[PDB]
Design a protein around this ligand. Structure first.
Ligand SMILES: *[C@@H]1O[C@H](CO)[C@@H](O[C@@H]2O[C@H](CO)[C@@H](O[C@@H]3O[C@H](CO)[C@@H](O)[C@H](O)[C@@H]3O)[C@H](O)[C@H]2NC(C)=O)[C@H](O)[C@H]1NC(C)=O
Ligand SMILES: *[C@@H]1O[C@H](CO)[C@@H](O[C@@H]2O[C@H](CO)[C@@H](O[C@@H]3O[C@H](CO)[C@@H](O)[C@H](O)[C@@H]3O)[C@H](O)[C@H]2NC(C)=O)[C@H](O)[C@H]1NC(C)=O
Ligand SMILES: *[C@@H]1O[C@H](CO)[C@@H](O[C@@H]2O[C@H](CO)[C@@H](O)[C@H](O)[C@H]2NC(C)=O)[C@H](O)[C@H]1NC(C)=O
Ligand SMILES: *[C@@H]1O[C@H](CO)[C@@H](O[C@@H]2O[C@H](CO)[C@@H](O)[C@H](O)[C@H]2NC(C)=O)[C@H](O)[C@H]1NC(C)=O
Ligand SMILES: *[C@@H]1O[C@H](CO)[C@@H](O[C@@H]2O[C@H](CO)[C@@H](O)[C@H](O)[C@H]2NC(C)=O)[C@H](O)[C@H]1NC(C)=O
Ligand SMILES: *[C@@H]1O[C@H](CO)[C@@H](O)[C@H](O)[C@H]1NC(C)=O
Ligand SMILES: *[C@@H]1O[C@H](CO)[C@@H](O)[C@H](O)[C@H]1NC(C)=O
Ligand SMILES: *[C@@H]1O[C@H](CO)[C@@H](O)[C@H](O)[C@H]1NC(C)=O
Ligand SMILES: *[C@@H]1O[C@H](CO)[C@@H](O)[C@H](O)[C@H]1NC(C)=O
Ligand SMILES: *[C@@H]1O[C@H](CO)[C@@H](O)[C@H](O)[C@H]1NC(C)=O
Lengths: 438, 91, 200, 50, 41
């Protein structure tokens, strides 16, 4: 007979980090296997289409990563802008909206996310560098035929998609995600999200300042949590480190002999006459072929993993940011209210805003109230008792109300319900109609 | 033609010295050489106007074949993401 | 073979905690503190969730409880009677055994060499010829290891996808009530209960 | 103008079986390829990081 | 869009006219009170 019901609540903001893309690599078959060697290349041609297969696999990966980024971020048909007032009922979005004063027009949180992740490749034109460094320091430094392609969407252009999405959800809620963007006052969007999680609108309006303060504090906590904890962005750093490790391994394999007299192809050609050099080269070719097949296989498996993660991130954007989801733990821990995306290198970070019950109290309950020989059931909510009187309350928020014929429905007698208790069920019309004459 | 990973100065110098391995050359005049993040793009005129991406190049730069001025040619441009729509938000 | 980080007892403890949470508090423990609710009232909520009024449950509560007890007994009899029901998990074990047995069997392959035993190669042949035959055996064994690891990575990806689906099912079927048709079984979803199984 | 409406119901319990984990293995590359053989190990070193 | 008259059947009451920010003054029509007045006269 005991039921515990929340008497208070906390608005909580949590963080979910998902990879969206991996570095787009390109491998120069002739340079890796037979770098600047005609005799080796001619021997390489006797193995057929192998490189062509490698080139198609790496091109397909690069295209797949561009496809994943486009699907994850380019889900809005227009670039939405926020109003110049930046007043949303008292809610402070200065930590998630673009900061106009700095280059790249990223939010405070996005610059923090970018500063935390260290990018090993950062593809761009690098030939200009050449020497004068202490050492070449790479991950082939281009020289061994391994390069990194730039993304089609730049970091600024991802930030613009994030800004459009934030402006859309802040000013129109979920309406723009299913057609035209319809403006709505923010407290009225949140009130409807509250209705979505089973808590009435008056709870939000009565406590609007408390909710706004809890939201602003939670956002500040997110900023401090990301700043303080150096390992928060683990998944993205792991993706970067795994691609750097794969390329470091592929380049380092060039120094191996694989049974040859020397790992340097020019030494083989200088020291031996063609008929023996061809054998030593064939041994080196076999070793390099094994290294390239291993590298590409690992890149394809990782690409499949990234595709699955990107598909999950796009799914979460659609159900969490452009809508409201009733799937438990899908959009953060707790009851989902709303989410905000943030750009991160090679991925996306979601800020999930949820409603969490707090300060519960345990009341006595009953399946039904028997009045004039009839079983009265709630239309919405549950019955509670404070020890002297019975009330109807919401399941997610304590709010005692008088049990009346406008809040309950009647079906059957009071003998069938096992836990039914005796209490008065008031009827508003009768008291006034009895009040009306007598 | 996009020459990946190199400066347009280096490519122009290699062309003048006849040091490049491809035996074909792309006709090059002023305004036809554009420096991108991916590499040096030769044979496409860069314009200020953005459009929807047709043929992607990289780092936000796309190319397409369009009629210019009065005369069709390949152009390069910064990708447009969509039309702008400012929502009339009010209390 | 390395042991799992969480032992069978620890998995059983997680399953027990999930069952206690679901039975005592339903969907509540997955989104705030656990709040006790009488079980018939939890079911009344779930029935309302699927579009059936609370009085249907309360008028027929003993019918529903009897159907539940019968269905659970049928589950126990179904799993006992039909060994193929758990084939999805048995295949995971069997494939792994086969992969390991295959890799060991590859040590007996010659790969074109005169013998599979390195000590025989070293004993009967001069270093040069022994080096050629050994290098050949090294190449064959490296190829076998690359095949094994590639297959393990592919199966690991399949297991990862299955584990992610299982995690989604725990959150949406056990720690809540799902509206996804046929996601949490056939029919309108009322509730789910996890059970631990080896490797799954 | 014809609609079918249930007059009774059944509470059904079904079973879904999903893999969660696989046996965790570890391979001694040198021992597998070149078990207790110094010469084999010395040739194996020429294959680098495999 | 389908405008309806605001009545005590379409809305619910909780709290007074103070805590809600942006509340506006408008008449909410009771169905019963009008009907009861018709029953009288
Ligand atoms: C929305 O929230 C942000 C913070 O998340 C508010 O910005 C903050 O505004 C206060 C008061 O203007 C700043 O405090 C001042 O900071 C300067 C820094 O040099 C210091 O010298 C002053 O003595 C004072 O401490 C605070 O730093 C600033 N924080 C940030 C990150 O900008 C913003 O005003 C809020 N807007 C609304 C409409 O609520
Ligand atoms: C809706 O369907 C349920 C069954 O799914 C009906 O309950 C079932 O009613 C039959 C006939 O009254 C019961 O059969 C009898 O069971 C006793 C058990 O001792 C046996 O001795 C009799 O010979 C006969 O077999 C059946 O047990 C019962 N099932 C349950 C779970 O209670 C229910 O009456 C149906 N309701 C309507 C409105 O049609
Ligand atoms: C249970 O609730 C009832 C009604 O809310 C409480 O009775 C009221 O108490 C206030 C003082 O706090 C009085 O002003 C009202 O006139 C009382 N109303 C009635 C109908 O008695 C009751 O005290 C509560 N009991 C407990 C144990 O919380
Ligand atoms: C609720 O009130 C009804 C009466 O309005 C109670 O019914 C009576 O119960 C007593 C025994 O407790 C019988 O001796 C009477 O004959 C019953 N009268 C009627 C008209 O049913 C009912 O028991 C009360 N329930 C509770 C839980 O107090
Ligand atoms: C709605 O009506 C109430 C009265 O029923 C208004 O409250 C009065 O506002 C005037 C403003 O000059 C005050 O002088 C009165 O003392 C107020 N009376 C009470 C009882 O509060 C209220 O301002 C009206 N609101 C709007 C938006 O018109
Ligand atoms: C409320 O919960 C506490 C938890 O310790 C328990 O001790 C107490 O008896 C409960 N009261 C009721 C009325 O259920
Ligand atoms: C709920 O908790 C907040 C925490 O700041 C507090 O300010 C508020 O008064 C509490 N409300 C109730 C009804 O306990
Ligand atoms: C090309 O070289 C010039 C030399 O002055 C340099 O300024 C320019 O930044 C270089 N471009 C790239 C893409 O490296
Ligand atoms: C693009 O616009 C800028 C504006 O200052 C101009 O300087 C530049 O030459 C323009 N580019 C082209 C290709 O017209
Ligand atoms: C919304 O209300 C705030 C309250 O401070 C006010 O400053 C702002 O100008 C209002 N905006 C509109 C469009 O009425």
């Amino acid at each position: 007979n005991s039921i515990a019901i929340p008497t208070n609540f906390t608005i909580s903001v949590t963080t979910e980090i998902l990879p969206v893309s991996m570095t787009k690599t390109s491998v120069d078959c002739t340079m890796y296997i037979c770098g600047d060697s005609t005799e080796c290349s001619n021997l390489l041609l006797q193995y057929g289409s192998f490189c062509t297969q490698l080139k198609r696999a790496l091109t397909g990966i690069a295209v797949e990563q561009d496809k994943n980024t486009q699907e994850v971020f380019a889900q809005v048909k227009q670039i939405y802008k926020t109003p110049p007032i930046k007043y949303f009922g008292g809610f402070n979005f200065s930590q998630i909206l673009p900061d106009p004063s700095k280059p790249s027009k990223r939010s405070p949180i996005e610059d923090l996310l970018f500063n935390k992740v260290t990018l090993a490749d950062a593809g761009f034109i690098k030939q200009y560098g050449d020497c004068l460094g202490d050492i070449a320091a790479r991950c082939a430094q281009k020289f061994n035929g391994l390069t990194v392609l730039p993304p089609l969407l730049t970091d600024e252009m991802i930030a613009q998609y994030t800004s459009a999405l934030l402006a859309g959800t802040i000013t129109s809620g979920w309406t723009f995600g299913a057609g035209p963007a319809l403006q709505i006052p923010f407290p009225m969007q949140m009130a409807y999200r509250f209705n979505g999680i089973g808590v009435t609108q008056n709870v939000l309006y009565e406590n609007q300042k408390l909710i706004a303060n809890q939201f602003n504090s939670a956002i500040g906590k997110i900023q401090d949590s990301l700043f303080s904890t150096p390992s928060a962005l683990g998944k993205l750093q792991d993706v970067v480190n795994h691609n750097a490790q794969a390329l470091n391994t592929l380049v380092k394999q060039l120094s191996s002999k694989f049974g040859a007299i020397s790992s340097v192809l020019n030494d083989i050609l200088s020291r031996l006459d063609p008929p023996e050099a061809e054998v030593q080269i064939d041994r080196l070719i076999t070793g390099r072929l094994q290294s390239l097949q291993t590298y590409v296989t690992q890149q394809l498996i990782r690409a499949a993993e990234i595709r699955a993660s990107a598909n999950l991130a796009a799914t979460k954007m659609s159900e969490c940011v452009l809508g409201q989801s009733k799937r438990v733990d899908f959009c953060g821990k707790g009851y989902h209210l709303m989410s905000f995306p943030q750009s991160a290198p090679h991925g996306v970070v979601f800020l999930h805003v949820t409603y969490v019950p707090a300060q519960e109290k345990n009341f006595t309950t009953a399946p039904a109230i028997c009045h004039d020989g009839k079983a009265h059931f709630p239309r919405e909510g549950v019955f509670v008792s404070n020890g002297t009187h019975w009330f109807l309350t919401q399941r997610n928020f304590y709010e005692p109300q008088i049990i009346t014929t406008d809040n309950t429905f009647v079906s059957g007698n009071c003998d069938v319900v096992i836990g039914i208790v005796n209490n008065t069920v008031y009827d508003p019309l009768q008291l006034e109609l009895d009040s009306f004459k007598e | 033609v996009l020459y990946q990973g190199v400066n347009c100065t280096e490519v122009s110098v290699a062309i003048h010295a006849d040091q490049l391995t491809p035996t074909w050359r792309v006709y090059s005049t002023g305004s036809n050489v554009f420096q991108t993040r991916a590499g040096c793009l030769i044979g496409a005129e860069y314009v200020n106007n953005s459009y929807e991406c047709d043929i992607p190049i990289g780092a936000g730069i796309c190319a397409s074949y369009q009629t210019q001025t009065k005369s069709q040619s390949i152009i390069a441009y910064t990708m447009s993401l969509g039309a702008e729509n400012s929502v009339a938000y009010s209390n």
